[model samples]
Target chain A: NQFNPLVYTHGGKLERKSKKDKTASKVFEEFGVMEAYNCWKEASLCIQQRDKDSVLKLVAALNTYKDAVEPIFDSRLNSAQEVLQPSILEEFFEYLFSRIDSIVGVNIPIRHPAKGYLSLSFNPHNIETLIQSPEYTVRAKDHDFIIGGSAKLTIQGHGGEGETTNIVVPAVAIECKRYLERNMLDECAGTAERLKRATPYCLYFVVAEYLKLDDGAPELTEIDEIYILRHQRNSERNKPGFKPNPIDGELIWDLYQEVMNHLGKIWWDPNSALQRGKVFNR
Target chain B: NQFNPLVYTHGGKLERKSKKDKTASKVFEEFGVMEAYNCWKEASLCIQQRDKDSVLKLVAALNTYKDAVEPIFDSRLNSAQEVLQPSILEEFFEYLFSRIDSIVGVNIPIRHPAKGYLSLSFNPHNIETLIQSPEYTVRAKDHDFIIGGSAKLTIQGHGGEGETTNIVVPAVAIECKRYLERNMLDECAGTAERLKRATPYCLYFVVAEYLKLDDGAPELTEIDEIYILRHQRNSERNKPGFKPNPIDGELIWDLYQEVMNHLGKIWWDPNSALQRGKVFNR
Candidate 1:
């Protein structure tokens, strides 16, 4: 009778290392099963890829004892915090390698590219094309609204070190004002403001996090309330355009209008590209 | 105007240091304004009683500009890293004090029995309690369930230890059988039989985390599954359980029944508690 716990022999070598072997016994002997499980799972990937027969033998050995191999899972979807941990993720990768054959059961984009297309990120930048789709309309109140949570902008001095004054601007502005009435006048004023200064060297268009839609309205968050003083005065007009206080509901609405106005023509659907359910539009 | 950014008065006979007056400026100035605000907010009753005037002056001043005093929170809430530094928090405190007087309103908690909790960490434990409350359950859910979005826990084991080979045996055999029947009894028995001698401990307890009910069920997550052991001898037992791959639903029920039978009663209503909201009888 073999007194060894279990063993996996591989690598074309005769009498490969078995769990009954000293090293295998010491694996759980010195440390706990969690530690042993962790170590085994970590190296299982390369072993399986390189030596399938060896991995199978190891699995079969584990299968010999019901207690050694038990499934641990629950019905609830993975919590965000659980997903955030790095160590927990290592365990998942091990599980993935263990059942490489059954990985494609769920027809997800990862394995099934021909199936439904991946919407990727729910962010608004990717959603611009969706607006042009006939599937959704721009006039509908539900279709008209979108929110991008927080943003940051840099203030670079013309001839000196550029200082990044972090500003969390509300990305997608849900202008409560009537569309046409709010657009041209604001646009004319803004274009005049920027054009009067100079032909700006270059304007940058960047993405911000998803601004979750508030119950039919949009609101500002904590990150949207910081002030950045420039290293040089008059380097740029320090307009407090985005720092919103909690009580500044009116200011948020104004921000929304300015945002939509700046995104480009309103009637044409600024986020049309994302109207077809693609949200990553910034 | 002193012009020293220092407001002071001169005109007194050379006298012994008053410890209190001499240290007044030091008390507030040594820790920067934001920290002073927090420190003062949390100063002890004895300190507040002695420095009552100073605390009052600072508190009043801080409250006046509460609105204008901006709080710029860390922006990287969901990244795979911790972007907020201790220095950033210090800056936030400084910013708060700079704008304190113009705040117009202050909703901070300032009256604690022990320390008059006025600091930034007033009710620091708020994140957990607030998250557990049912009223804000929906809003809490949006946070991806992160109460503060910032906290860290570190753990380590002490002493050289082997795996726990502990097993809980009910006082009565019927009780043990009942406990088995209550949960995924078959699976529980399978796991138990597998790891009976290998593990140092086979823990069976009713933990709150395990008390999860099904989606349609009205609460009560108990009687689901319990842990078992893994011994080298039970390789065959392991095979059947592994082959079918079923949940250990009846295991918990049986264990609970075993304990209940040993006690000779079962308590259903936790509200009838001698310990506020705990069941005294079953």
Candidate 2:
């Protein structure tokens, strides 16, 4: 597994410190990012060993990271929380995929947005340098996390001069949000449409802490699924009898069930016709 | 001729004061909400008289409001600004439509998001109180500002036992954002689709200070138009030797031209086809 570790704790200089005498890295270290990395590593080991359930380990990582940063934002001044919340989900999914990669295939999850794994191209007669990198085309929607697999290509021409290319294709993509609004949902639907258009089997999901719109049915959209972990409307926080709803692990587990099932199955293959005698629809 | 004035200087009490001894209303007062109100009123007078250019007066209100709030946010924090920027645009559009109202018929602009204006229904029978309000059915997307006309419904039965209703129909809707992202644009497209479905003649617009996506062709989508006032990308602010781009009055003028033309014309009359010698398409 040659995947680059996401968190690198670079030492902060005085110039990097803010007006409040706290460096951003220092504040982020206190904000549970570093602790979450450690929790992810521990969870990965347990998941690999199968000594502990993957869902149980996921709950541990979820609580370890989110619980640490949850109380920092004052009720009214959610400015800091607004910034950190998206990152929490990003890294949490990173951790979730990292744990899954431990059991399935390592180095499958990319921290950045990726696509075009099945794509191939040839360079003009360069056998030695044949296997280069995938051509970067199609500006992609930035997702919080992508579970992808790497592909290698060997393009050989009649002149016996050919080069190869490597690419990562997006399999599962998740959009993490602080709150889900109608416009946000619409955007996700559009993203899902374009994404699946390019890579037909790719699964798209949306995860939000709270609902901002009065009603939105995800079943009608291109998005494969939506997970609202907090199970609360955004306005609930402003009401008098408001209680802070923590991220429920059950919702996270439900998302895990879908992702796990997708990873275990063989994707839409028409070539296996006689063996299975049937083709299935997604 | 009746439209609700957007700004009311409600008194701020001691309980409304924050830890910084600054009341939210007081802070907003200094933030140019009131000054913009005066500027809007003065601009409205000029617009009605045709004494001054509507575009020129529109720029004044834009400067009056945005300039006042621009310097308040510290370069990096931008915490307070994330909340105020959307409000600034919301109020600015209100001023824009108010000026438009002076020339055309009044009472068409609704500050809140509105739709279902061309919709109607009836109660079984009520002769004495024959008029009521339209039924709220569809949950409308909340646009920052909406330009709409009031409709009156009259239902008279044979027995003289009937009721009437009133409704507001959305003609044009505008969504305001600090920066225009791809997802945000997608949401606008989906919204535009649903909006035009109910009211096919309705126009949908998106206004943002900066662009966020690398490539988005709005021509392929349902959104009518987009206005990026500052004409800058979201990340340009982070580059070295970055120059702050101000909201261009020309862009505002362009938006005004489109809106003014739409307001002045009669919308979709199929019956008048024989009079004008054929039907026209939007």
Candidate 3:
């Protein structure tokens, strides 16, 4: 399913694509069956208002939806990564991100607002195969949400016939994990670095409910940022004093602004070498 | 449990550390129970002989153990990733790599011949706590096997007292997976890049049972190489004409050689920078 919450909840060659879909599919299977979908109905108004108060309203609505579903899948509290945590994230993000078309020109189609596999880079399979079979294989990573535009590579007679095929080039890619851990950080950094080779302007972030990362994390790397929505470490969850910090609206609003700022400017220009003095300053 | 095959095959704060041990632990649970554990019994002579034929003999012995367990795990043929594939790989690599001491000088020390968490980098957590709690958080990754040396961060009175804590700095890190897929390749590349940040000379490789990578996958990235033991596409596994390739001794021997050549050299002598023009041509 495209995960178009605006219409009502109704539910790939690359395994990552299906992988994302599978994670998102459980969202509708769990929540959509129990709760009548109404979060995006409010997000629509918030997008139109385009203010902090609107964002808070939208977050409150989402949290209500999130809260209502807690009893539906109560047994999955510990095994959150397997089903619950990632599924809610995939749908919640889809509903949240699909509203950006009004903000970033509707004609500039938002790709994979729900969940999709975003290409990092593609290359002709091999010189001989390109001249014969003539197809390219993409190196991609699955994201919970992606904002992208499509572009095509047309190879001429590489397979005795010319053809064109398109791929989604991500501008903003988000990974949803139940918790952010050390190895997962490496995975994100690696994904970001390779993605930059193709779309150097792309933004990548890790959105998780709990943090297992260092306080000194998120520095000295290509990852744009990591947002821990719950604002607490995963290990702290079981302690008696551990009060769950519900996902905050402010952080989500800041994430929206971060994406807007990153996409609003020129990534690089040869003329910038002359204007900015040290072209590397950015 | 240390995966020391030299002793009896009897088998951390960081989850990755236990994560590695658990994977290797399954190796003992699955293969160790059925097999009489006689592979390393022959590997001892092969390491002493130090020749290609001896490597072949070593591979043959390991293959015998591998083949024997196949009947025991016949039911898990379809779901190899859960218990069978990774278990065999953990034990196989352990038996093969543990012999490196005779080659790399016994004193250098091999860190995780079976599996362990190897550090990428570490930092003091917020300046204020360093003078109080004074502990550093490490960014690390779990590897199927690692060869490393120990080093300490001697922080003096960042707290009220000075302390030296050691971390294993990886020189060679190998990740074992059931199959290499598109998303998994992104993960390996990401792991390699950050690992280079901490240990630039470290070699990282992915040893998987089946190939799910494009022919051009390994190039233009930080990953040194990906060795598919089966040397066939995963999708091809079920084809009527599909004939599985037994793990070739030649390939395993070549992997051994690659490690030797890498560790055998001076990674970079600053003197060479001046001696050679166009120093980027590594």
Top candidate (TM-score): 3
- The alpha-carbon RMSD over the true interface for every model, in angstroms, is 28.1, 30.8, 20.6
Each prediction's RMSD over C-alphas, in Å, is: 34.3, 29.2, 25.2
How do the residues B1-282 of candidate 3 rate in per-residue lDDT, one tens digit apiece?
A: 223433222111112222555644464466563234444454544455546987777777766665665554454343333444355555555556665555554333444543322331112232223223323233456676776554333333213354544345556788878678888788778777767655566778878768876666454288887787777788887799986677778888888888777665555546666787644444
Query: What digit string (tens of lDDT, one per residue) describes model 3 on residues A127-225?
Result: 223223323233456666776554333334223353544445566788878688888788778777766554555678888878886766554388778
DockQ (0 to 1) for model 3 = 0.01
Poorest stretch of ten by lDDT in candidate 1 chain B: B138-147
Each model's DockQ? 0.01, 0.01, 0.01
lDDT of 2 by residue, B1-282 (tens): 555545311111112232334544465456654455456556544554222365666676667656654565333224445544565666666556555445654434344444433222111111111112111121346677676543333333222332334444466678888798877787777777666654565677888889888855654377888888888988997799987677888888778778777666655455677677877644
Native interface contacts kept by each candidate, as a fraction: 0.00, 0.00, 0.00
- Please give the C-alpha DockQ score of model 1: 0.01
- Taking chain B only, the TM-score of every model is 0.14, 0.68, 0.73
Cα misplacement distance, residue A63 of candidate 3 (Å): 49
In order, how many clashes per candidate? Answer: 76, 6, 4
Tens digits of lDDT, candidate 1, A1-282: 111111221111112222334443343344344443445544454344313355444433323221231212111213211221222212322232233222212111111001110011101111111111101111111111222111111111112232222211111212111112223334433432222121111111111111222234222221122111111122122356632111122332333334334333222233664674642234
User: What is the number of residue pairs that collide in model 2?
Assistant: 6
Tens-place lDDT per residue, model 2, A152-179, is 3233322234233444446678888978
lDDT of each: 0.23, 0.55, 0.56
